[PDB]
Every structure is written in structure tokens, then in C-alpha cells.
Amino acid sequence: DVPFVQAYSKFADDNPRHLRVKTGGKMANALTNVIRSYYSINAPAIVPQV
Amino acid sequence: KLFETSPFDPLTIKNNQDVVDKLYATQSSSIQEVVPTKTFATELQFGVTS
Amino acid sequence: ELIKVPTIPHNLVLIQSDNGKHALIKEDLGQWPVETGISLVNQAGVFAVQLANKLGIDKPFVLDAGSNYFTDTSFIDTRKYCTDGLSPREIQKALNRQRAYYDRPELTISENKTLLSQSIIYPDADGNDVSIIFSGAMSHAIFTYAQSQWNKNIIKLDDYIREITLTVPKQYRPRRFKEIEHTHGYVYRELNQGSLLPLVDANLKESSSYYFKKLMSSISNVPVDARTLQSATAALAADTGQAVNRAQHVSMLTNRLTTANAPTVRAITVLTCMFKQFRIGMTYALDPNIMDVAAATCMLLFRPAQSISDEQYRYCLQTMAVFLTNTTYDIVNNDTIDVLKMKLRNQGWPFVERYNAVEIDMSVEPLRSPGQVGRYYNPFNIDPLTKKHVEDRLEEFINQVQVGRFRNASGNAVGTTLAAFLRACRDKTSANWRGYSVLVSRYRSLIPNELFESLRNISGEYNINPQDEHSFFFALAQINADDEFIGAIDKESAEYLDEYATLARDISNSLTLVKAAFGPLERTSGSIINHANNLNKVINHVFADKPLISETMLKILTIDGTTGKDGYRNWLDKLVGHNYPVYVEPVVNIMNFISARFVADSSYFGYTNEIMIMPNHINVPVDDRFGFRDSPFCTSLPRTIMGNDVRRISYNVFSMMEDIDDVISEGFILYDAYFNFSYDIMTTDGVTRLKEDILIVTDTGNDIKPIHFYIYFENRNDKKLRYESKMNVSYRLYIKTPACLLPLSDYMRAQHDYVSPSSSRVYIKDPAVVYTRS
Amino acid sequence: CMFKQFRIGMTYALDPNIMDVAAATCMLLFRPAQSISDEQYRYCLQTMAVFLTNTTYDIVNNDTIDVLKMKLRNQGWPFVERYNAVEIDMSVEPLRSPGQVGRYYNPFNIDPLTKKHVEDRLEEFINQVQVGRFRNASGNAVGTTLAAFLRACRDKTSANWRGYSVLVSRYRSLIPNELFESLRNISGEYNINPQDEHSFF
Amino acid sequence: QAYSSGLSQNSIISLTGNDRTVADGTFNSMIMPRAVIANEREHFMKTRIDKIE
Amino acid sequence: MDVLSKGSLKELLAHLEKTPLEEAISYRIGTVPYQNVLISRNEYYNQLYPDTTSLIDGVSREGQRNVNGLIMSIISYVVSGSGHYIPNIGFMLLRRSILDILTKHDTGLVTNNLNYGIIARNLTVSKMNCEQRKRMLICFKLLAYKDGNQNDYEIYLNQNIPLKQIAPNFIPGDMRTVIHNQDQLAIVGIPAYRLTQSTELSIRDDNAKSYKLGYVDWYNSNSFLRERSEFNLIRLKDRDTKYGKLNGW
């Protein structure tokens, strides 16, 4: 499972755990909110630039 | 002559660390704002080792 | 300091057959023996440290592989070709030999250029250099994880300064950093602060006695102004007429004066005002004299009320009542403080009250006390704002004592002697309190807030003699701050800082050891016996070779006369079941990672959980990727063979089996044990076999002999070796294919990325921001 | 004097001595107020108060400048003010190159027009220190010793201010205009030991 | 105890918003209801119109 | 000048915490805000140069006595360096900090009726530059959080497309958002370009250049605080700290 551990660690900035759901970490949250902003001007811009 | 003793010879340096090291070596020639003495420390934490 | 690793530790090797038909890439991380019947995680911890040393990641480091590159001769190619990792030329040589066997044409120029340019170095946005090289998977995963852990403690110099600004005293000249260091300076610092409370709270008498002794030695050497006692004594003799012919109370005060123990008392004075609750004791004579009353009055007036306990306060009041009111100790034995205060006040004695010292805040944040405000008491109970005693009616009280009638209805011999003596003490304390206030503040900066609020005078070693107390205030010496003394303090601050940091590391190590080794105790003989034996085993191991804990801790534990081993054993015992939080360090994270991979990927390190013994006439699926003859490796151990599930026997049951001959005829899988195995891959062709027999039968039990595979590559059209395999081998041993083996065709799976920090960065060994004044 | 952005700093001992106060009062009197920072100004006033008013640094750590001035003035110490330097206009004759015009602070806070120190009550102030009593319980002849130093410093500065004023103008004439403009961007602060400052004057 | 009717009621959204105060110079401020009995100018104007009818 | 030098959200909010309201209010009479006037610019033209005075000029103007004028004086102080003439506000309000007025209900000032569009138009948001608009939007967000008008603030941003792009990202109750923010809010600073002692045509540009040239003099003055050389002489209470938190955040 080393190739998946390395890939997920870079993507999610955290090591995968057996009993925890693999969600994608900060990158998943940033991508989800950024998609929301593109669709509508009414959607807020939550993600910081940093 | 711009300098009595040159701050550093450019040909001898190789990276940024040599510039810092050479500047410390030739600082006695220049008029220094603060003349160095023994250094005083206020914080020190040792980490656990292998 | 930080170590710059020049080369990436790839662990790849290339194995190819003599004819060149088959080639494989193998990652060699060593072989580690594993023992069954005990916890595997604990064993993995021992091997993780050894593995880290092999890869060179045990100590803090930064990769410095940016400069390991060359440029091609072609004018179009401006890429940088990395020299780390497995050489692409080695793969090209192996690939060409494979094509020669199959009679295919050799690699073309276009194909050669693509293969030879696989390993490159390119810069990223942040200025770091990224190296793409061929390397092992576990070597890449472990090395890169250790990089991210050490990088957490590498910060810019300006960030470090901002974190330590509040602790910088005003009397030190600021350090001028070079312009390069302000822009590109970095420091490796661990900024977590470990509490010393676990050591102090468990061992209060030992910790307090050690620090008080060290502080007392320093304060005892402070220079003082040399002022003779003749001027003070002459004034006292004049005020209370002193005659050589007659016997007077004033003489008993004068002949008892002595400055021999003055340096000791003045160090006690600093200790009382430096700590929150430093209680001092005082024992008077069986028959009190005028010296005891003067000494007792001086203690109540010029010492903090926090230093005098209620029992000592009552004892001081009892001594005054015995002398002044002409009563016995037995009568005043049962009287309370309020009753005693009324007796002395009715007779005309007003000095029956304790006075609280005024706290002064330190200018800077105390060391090891982040976000906290320090405090200390002003000496001699003088309010700094008013520059006089806390009691505003002290002048009136002294006059009242002068006209009072004590020990005699007629005359004022006792009152005049005490009033004249007390006026002298008041004047000396008024003139010389500033010097002692500066002295106290200097030594307060040495101790943290935890030591300020925790250390207590439990043993009672520092008790002031009555002759020393009354001579101290009568002959008070002004404090002179010599340049030699000032420099001595600066040296002590450096040693105190190192000692606190050393103690914090030892406490953190001991807290980790207790949690992992010892469980909870029970009210049973078995639990007590088990705990006692395990405790001795740990203590013997920690003190063997280079001791885990430093000599500074051993000095604190041995201050009572016990041995170092005994002192540590008691302290570890109290730590069992602690709720103290322990900050997880980068090296602990690294070891837990390697331990997790050791358990998860066992084939990399030479052991497996399951083996299979099967007769030769039974055909089993095997891994044919590598071209091995009679490959002992299976992609997975088959669940079913010939339509029936393969029988699985635990090692313990197989050891006790007496019908083993019937079982082996069918075949079985052995599990519930860790099987250490080794293999050798030979380039020639031959019969693949094991070094030893598979199993050994004894009257006691059955066992499996050590496993060592001799693996050869296969030439299909060889009748001699085909016949020998089927007829000279009866039983075969199968294990899951090791994950370190990788066919040459999948050489693109060995490509991995390593990031090295920018070369513009300069690392500062000494990040302190101030100089000494002289 | 030549560069206005440069500052002068000073570090004193935890228990200031007569050298620290003499060095502190020499800097406030004979150095431009534009060179001395506000934080340095408060630090010097704190040093004077600790020695003369019988207090400690921790006690007077949070006191402001006006509070510190009141404490020293009540005790009898008049030197609690920074004095602005007088700008001396300078010109380099052209000769082959085009000329340059500049300005520099006159050394030792001496006005060339009045040929005296800027403070017009200096003689009265020094006489006040001579007759003052500062640490009666723990000091001897502090006022007389400090006053004698002040008169010696005042006489020497008034005697040798022209020589140092000419020296600054001579150094300013060596720097070309392009170099001077670039040197305006940089900044610095110079730390002088209290022993060296008093020994200089 | 106040009488409680279980009558189903629709949700009501105010013109003022969450802060419960209308913003100055807005279209909502112009359509806000305003007191007629309390204001003298309106309570006088409506009586005159009622008398005229 | 000091308020215009702050370049990060943390420094701006820290300055507003220690600055009372009386610094925003000016006690000079000034002139009426919106007037077409002729000014003299002799470096460029012989004839008088037309211009229109405004509230975001660097010179004090006369202000309305209502709450709208007080908020409009605070924003003009932040973006232009000077406030307006609103006298007789009172000791209780004037002694409070600017952050307390914008964020705290205990001040006793009621500001929930304010209209962000009218305030922006009166402040001439069209004439503001990027840094000035970012600073004003910070003031709007603090006011919205105080009054529970977060939804109204978002809708006002949706109507104004340019304002939404430059809107600073921070939650007015969490200090972690302020530290992370990297927006550059400086109006005056050390100039990388060539800055000359020359006049500008408009009132706003000429007054801004005066602060820019004054800041350079202030930077080399003895009043400026040099953290690199005099960090130990600063008092501990006001010394720079990495773990610096506004009260209640």
C-alpha cells in the first residue's frame, strides 16, 4: 500500500488511517468550495488566498 | 580607494554562506555599530534524540 | 547542528540472467530477525531506529542534492541530468541485453535519449530543487516523511526572534545580524517547553534542597562595603549609657554581636524574597534574653509575613511575653495568638504584628514561563512607592517602647536599650534596601515560574541563629555590584538554562518509558511480583552502557544520599499512571512510521506470516513474471487447490502433531507465526531448491528449519534440469512474492521525487539576539 | 552630524554608577536630539532616576517621560531635556565638477551665532547640581563630583567646537553627490560604551 | 396562562432583516407600514376625508 | 501617517485597538465637502486648476452631527489620514477605541440602520484606490458583525463586482483568520521608485504625496521605533509578540 499512502499524504497533508474516512483533507475542502464560487456570483468566497 | 580592506573578495566565495562567513572575518576593519562580545541566550530547549 | 545530506539513499540493485532473457530490480533494505510469542510492535521499535541510521535520517537533516547534475552535449538539451539513484545507463544496458536474446534490434537513438533523460533536476516555484530519480518505494516513503518532520522545526530567523522578544532584558546590547541572514536566515530550533513539575512534585525535598544549595553558594560571594561597627556601637553606648563598672542589658546585646555568618544570612534574605513561600525557622534560648527579644522583633519587622509560619509567629510572640511580661513558657503554652497579642499590648509592647512584603513585577518575561508575569518581594518590608516601611507608625511605636516599663516597675533600662537598637536597624534598612532589591531581582531571573511557586523549605536546613539575626540588621552591609560579580551571574544564567533544558528532556524520556513498559497494579501477589521484576529489568537496561538520563538528574535524586540507580527507580515508580501530557517529537513520529511499515510490509524485511508445504505432484499457481525456475513465490497463497480449500494449521498445533506424516501427504498452510526467510538469485540455470530440509521431527516436537531459497532462472528446453526438478524434489515450500522484487519492464514504477531546499538559505548556529554589556 | 538617519545608543548596568549618569548626561547635552531616539531618551531618564532618586529599574519600568521628568526635577536634577542641534549650511566649490550643497549638525549643540550651548540656563543648571543632595543616606559628594565633571565637559566642548565643526565639513567635501544620495536610504544605530563616551568628552 | 391555538401558520419574513431595523434610503423603508393613530398629521387627514364622504 | 503605514490586517486592527476615537475626530473647521473649486498649481499651469473637494481628502472637512458622520469620519481617517469636524460627541464615546466603536455593543452607539451603499457613495468609492477600498471594506465587515448583518454585507458585495474580488478574507471574531491574512493594506511606505519633491495636480494626489514624503522623514526621525535595534527597550506590554490576540478574539 506504499504507493497509495504516499499519494494520499501529498494530496491530503495527512497520513491515511484504517478507522478514519479518507476525505482528501484540506485540498478536498478547498476544491469543493472553489467549485461553488464559480457557478454563482451569490456564492461566498470562503477559501483564503493563503 | 573605496575600502582600506575589502569586505570580501568576490572570486573566493561560492555561495551565500561564504559571504556571511567572510563578512564576520573582516568586520574588525569596518566601523561597527556594535562591537561583538560573548553572546547571551535567553531560550534553550533540547529535543529527544534517536 | 543540521546535517546536509549530499546524496539520496536509493537502495536499488539490478539482477539479470547470463543470457539476458530475464532482469529484475530489487530493493535491499536488509534482513531483520523476528521472534514469535512476543509483541511484534515492540520488536519493530528496535528495528526502526537501526533502519533510520542506515538511511541517515535519525538526526535532523536537510537534503542538499540540488548540485548533483550534468548537462548533455546537445545544444537543444538544456535539462539538468541527475546523477543520484539507479543510473539510467544501467537500465539501458540491461534492456539491450534483453533485446539481444530475442534478436530484436537495439534501442534507437530516440529511445536511448528518452531513457537517459528520465532522471532530471528541475526548479520549483519556491526556489527548491526537485530530483526525479529511480529509487525504492519504501526508501522514498520513509526518507520523504522524515524530511517533512524535521522541516517543522526549521523556521526563519525573524520568526524565531519574534518568539523570544519578551524574554530579552534591557541591560544587554542588541546583536546586529548581517543583511543576508535577515533575508535568507534559518534556524533549527525545537520550541516546545517541557514542564519540570513531574520531577518537582514527586521529589519536593530533593529538588528544593538542590536548588537552594546552588543559589546559596552564588549569593554568598556578593561583595559588600566594608563599614566598621565602631560608629554603630558608639552611638548605641551613648544613647543607652554603658558603664564598664556596671552590668547593663545593653552589654548583653553588644558582646553577642558577630559578623562571621553575615554572608550566609544575606543569602537567606534573598531566598525569602525570591520564592513565593520560603519559610525560615528560629530557635531561641531556653531562658530568653534581651538578644532573643531583639532578634524576634527584627524577624517580625524586616522579614516577609510569607516567610513566617503561624507556629513560628506564635513562638516569637511567646518569647517576647516570657521576657517582657515576666511569665513562664508553661503559662503561655496554651495561649493563642490573639491572647498573646493582648498581653504584650497591655504592657506597652506594640510590635506584635506581621507585615506583608510588597510585590514588584519583573520587567521581562521569566525564562521557561511563556505568557506569564514574574514577581518578587521587596526586602525589609519597605514599600517601593513610599520608600519607607509598610508600617507608617513605626516612629511612634519606637517612642512608645522607649517610655515603656518592662521587667521592672521603675526605670526604662529595657525600653531604652530596645528602642535605641531598633532605631539603628530601621536606619540601616532604609539606606540599604535598594541594593538588596537589585540583588533579589537578578537571582529571580534565574528561576522559572514553576520553581517560584513550588519549591518549599521542607527540610528546615536554613534556620537563622538569634545572634546572627540581630547582628545582621545592626551591621547591615551595603551591596556592591563588582564587574567580576556581574560576569559571574551571566555565566550562571547560561548554566541554569542548559540545566533546565536537560531536565526537561529527561522528564519527557522517563514519561515515555513508563507508559510503554508498565501497566497498572493490582492487590495480588502476582501483580506485585511481576511489577518488581519488570522494574528491575528496566532500571538495569537504562543504566547500562551510556545512561539514558543525564548527570544533572542524578545529582537531584542523590542529594539525600541514595544511589543513582535507587533514586531513579523510586521516581519511575511514582510516574506509573501519570496524566502528564507529553508533546510528541519529530523523532517519535519518524519511528512510529517505520514501525508501521515494518508490520504492514513484512516481505521487504525478510519475514512472512504464512508458508505452504505441498507435494511436488500437486500443481499450484506461481508468479511467472520473473522467469524463475520452479518459482517458490505465489502472488497470493491459494484459497482453493483442486476445488478444495487448503488446510491451515497453526504452528503450535503442528508442533504437537504426532500424525504429521499423514498431514504432509495432502499439503497444508502454516500460520500463527513469523517465518524468517532468505533467498539468493543466481544468474545461471539450475534446480531451485532449499538449503536445508523443510522440517525436523523430534520426540519433543516438530519444527521448521531455517529457510534459504536457491533461485535460478529457467531455460525451458533443458531436459536434464526438468527431470531433476520433478524426480529429485518431493516437497516444495511456497511464500508470497516479496514486494521488493520488481521486473525490469516496470522500471517506471521506480521513479520518485525528492525536494531539496533552496541553496540561498543560510543556517545560523547561534540565534541569540543580545550581547553581554562588557 | 553628517548623516541625520544615524542614531546613537547606550547600554547601562543594572545598578547604575556615577559613570553611567555622567555618560548619560553627556549624551543628552552634547549630542543632537535628532540622533537620540525616544526609547533611548526614556532609558537615559530611567538611569538618572535610579541613581539619583533611589529606586530600581523594575519600579520605574512603566513610568512615562513626563512622570520621570517630575521625579528628577523634584529631587533637584535639571538635565531632563534633549537639545536640538543647529544645522550648518555647507557648500563645495565647483572646480572641475559641478558643485554640491549640503547641511550638517554643528557638533556639541553649540550655536555659532551665540557661540554658546543651545541651553541658555546651562550655568544656572550646573550650579544647581553643585549644591544639591541626592543620596544622603547611601552616598557622599555625588552632587559635587557630578558638577565638576559637567563644568569640565562644558569648557572642553566650547573650546574645541570649531575644530570638530571644520572636521565634519572637511569629511563632507570628500563624498561625491551620487554616493551621498544613496547613503541616505540606509540607516544605522551606533552603540557606545558608557566609559568611552565620558572619556571622549 | 395565555390562550394557545394550534393553528398552522406560514413563516413570515420581515422587511427589516435579521438585525430587525430597516436600512436608510431603501425600497423597503418606503413600503414599511407606519402609525396612523399616533401621528397627528395622518389622524387629522383621515378624519377630514371620512367627514367629506 | 501611522495609520497609513500599516500594511497587514494584524497591524491595522492592533493600531485601531490602541487608538481612541478622538484621533479620528478633527477639531479644525475645514470646508464643506462637495464643492467645485479652483486651486493653484503653478508648477504645471498658469491658470487656476479646477477640482472637486471630497471627504476622503487629507484635509479636515465639516461633518454631519449624526451617527452617519461619525462612521464616515472613522473610515476617512483610515483611508485618508484625517477625519472631520463633529464636536460635542462626549467624553464617554471619545475615550473608546476605534475597534470598540466598530465591533462592540457596550459603547452605547447604535449603527444597525446604516446603509453601506450610501456610505460608500458619500465617501466616493469610485475615486478610491485598491488599498483604500480594501480598508473601507474591513470597516464594513466589522460593523456588520457587530450588528448581526453578515447576510447584508454579502449581498452588497454581490451587487458590486469589483468590491467582491478585493474583499479581505477574515472572520471578525477569530484571530486565526487575521494572522493568516496576507493582503497588503499599506498606503504609505518606503518607495522602490524615484520619489521627488514635486507637486501633484489633484487635491487627493497632492495630499497623499505629502503623507508619503512625510513618512520618509518619519522613518528616519527619532520618533520612529526600530524593532531590529531597540527591541529590548520597548515595554513588555506593547512589545511585539507572535501570540498576539485582540481581546475577545
CA B31 – CA D189 distance, rounded (Å): 12
Resolution (A): 2.6
CA closest to D189 among chain B residues? B33
Q: Which amino acid is at C113?
A: K
CA C11 – CA C136 distance, rounded (Å): 6
CA closest to C172 among chain D residues? D11
CA C543 – CA C568 distance, rounded (Å): 10
Contact C12, C26 (CB under 8 A): yes
- DSSP string for residues in F117-178: HHHHHHTTTTT--HHHHHHHHHHHHHHHHHHT-HHHHHHHHHH-HHHHHT-----TT-HHHH
CA C177 – CA F229 distance, rounded (Å): 10
By residue count, chain E amounts to 53
From the list C137, C186, C136, the residue with the least C-alpha distance to C158 is C186
Inter-chain residue contact C587 with B34, CB threshold 8 Å? no
Contact C267, C216 (CB under 8 A): yes
CA D24 – CA D44 distance, rounded (Å): 6
Inter-chain residue contact B42 with C497, CB threshold 8 Å? yes
| CA Rg value for chain C | 41
CA C741 – CA C28 distance, rounded (Å): 9
- Tell me the shortest Cα–Cα distance from F231 to chain A, in angstroms: 29
Contact C52, C591 (CB under 8 A): yes
Side-chain half-sphere CA neighbours of E13 within 13 A: 2
DSSP-assigned letter for residue E22? P
**Distance between the two ends of chain C, CA-based, in angstroms?**
28
What number of C-beta contacts closer than 8 Å exist between B and D?
7
Asked if F touches E (at least 3 Cβ pairs < 8 angstroms), the answer reads yes
Asked if C touches E (at least 3 Cβ pairs < 8 angstroms), the answer reads no
Q: For strand C3-5 and strand F61-62, is the pairing parallel, antiparallel, or unpaired?
A: unpaired
CA closest to B27 among chain C residues? C178
CA C440 – CA C582 distance, rounded (Å): 34
Contact F114, E25 (CB under 8 A): no
Inter-chain residue contact A48 with F169, CB threshold 8 Å? yes
Contact F169, F177 (CB under 8 A): yes
Q: For strand D116-117 and strand D110-111, is the pairing parallel, antiparallel, or unpaired?
A: antiparallel
Q: Is B25 in CB contact (< 8 Å) with chain C? A: no
CA C227 – CA C11 distance, rounded (Å): 78
Chain E contacts in chain F segment 33-92 (CB below 8 A): 68
DSSP-assigned letter for residue D142? H
Indicate the SS3 state at residue C549: coil
Q: Is A40 in CB contact (< 8 Å) with chain F? A: no
Chain C residues contacting D via beta carbons under 8 Å: 170-174, 360-363, 384-385, 387, 427, 430-432, 434-435, 437-438, 441-442, 478, 481, 486, 773
Count helices and strands (H / E) in chain B: 1, 1
Q: Nearest Cβ partner of C171 from D11, D56, D138? A: D11
Q: Is C223 in CB contact (< 8 Å) with chain F? A: no
Q: For strand C120-123 and strand C689-690, is the pairing parallel, antiparallel, or unpaired?
A: unpaired
C152-177 burial code (b ≥16 CB/10 A, e <16): ebbbebeebbbbbbbbbbbbbbbbbb
CA C54 – CA A27 distance, rounded (Å): 34
Write out the three cell numbers for C295.
532578634
Inter-chain residue contact D188 with B33, CB threshold 8 Å? yes
Distance of CA B1 to the CA centre of its chain: 24
| Distant-in-sequence contacts of F43-49, Cβ < 8 A, 24+ apart | F43/F198, F43/F199, F44/F199, F44/F201, F49/F201
Write out the three cell numbers for C477.
552591609
CA D172 – CA C310 distance, rounded (Å): 74
Asked if B touches A (at least 3 Cβ pairs < 8 angstroms), the answer reads no
- Tell me the shortest Cα–Cα distance from C770 to chain F, in angstroms: 9
Give the angle C86-C89-C93 at the CA atoms, nearest 5°: 115
Contact C129, C760 (CB under 8 A): no
Q: For strand C61-63 and strand C3-5, is the pairing parallel, antiparallel, or unpaired?
A: parallel
Contact residues on chain B for D191, CB-CB shorter than 8 A: 33-35
Question: Where does C562-632 show beta strands of DSSP type E?
Answer: 607-608, 611-615
Q: What is the dihedral of CA F51, F53, F59, F62, to 10 degrees?
A: 160
Q: What is the dihedral of CA F232, F233, F237, F241, to 10 degrees?
A: -30
- Residue C5 forms beta bridges with which residues? C63
From the list D141, D45, D50, the residue with the least C-alpha distance to C434 is D50
CA F30 – CA F27 distance, rounded (Å): 9
Contact residues on chain F for C179, CB-CB shorter than 8 A: none
Asked if E touches D (at least 3 Cβ pairs < 8 angstroms), the answer reads no
CA C249 – CA C264 distance, rounded (Å): 27
Inter-chain residue contact F180 with A48, CB threshold 8 Å? yes
Inter-chain residue contact A6 with C138, CB threshold 8 Å? no
- Other C-beta atoms within 10 Å of C650: how many? 12
Give the angle C348-C353-C357 at the CA atoms, nearest 5°: 145
- Burial environment of residue C486 by CB neighbours within 10 A (0 to 12, 13 to 18, 19 or more): middle
CA C149 – CA E19 distance, rounded (Å): 48
Q: Nearest Cβ partner of D38 from F223, F235, F237? A: F223
Main-chain dihedrals φ then ψ at residue C16, nearest 5 degrees: -135, 145
CA C331 – CA C318 distance, rounded (Å): 10
CA closest to C594 among chain A residues? A2
H helices present in C445-524, as ranges:
449-454, 466-474, 483-517
Contact F146, F67 (CB under 8 A): no
| Interface test mutation site (partner F, options E13, E14, E18, E27, max chain F beta carbons within 10 A) | E18
CA E32 – CA C368 distance, rounded (Å): 63
Cell 393553528 belongs to which residue? E7
D96-121 burial code (b ≥16 CB/10 A, e <16): eeeebebebbbbbbbeeeeebbbeee
Inter-chain residue contact F118 with E19, CB threshold 8 Å? no
Q: Is C170 in CB contact (< 8 Å) with chain B? A: no
Inter-chain residue contact B34 with C175, CB threshold 8 Å? yes
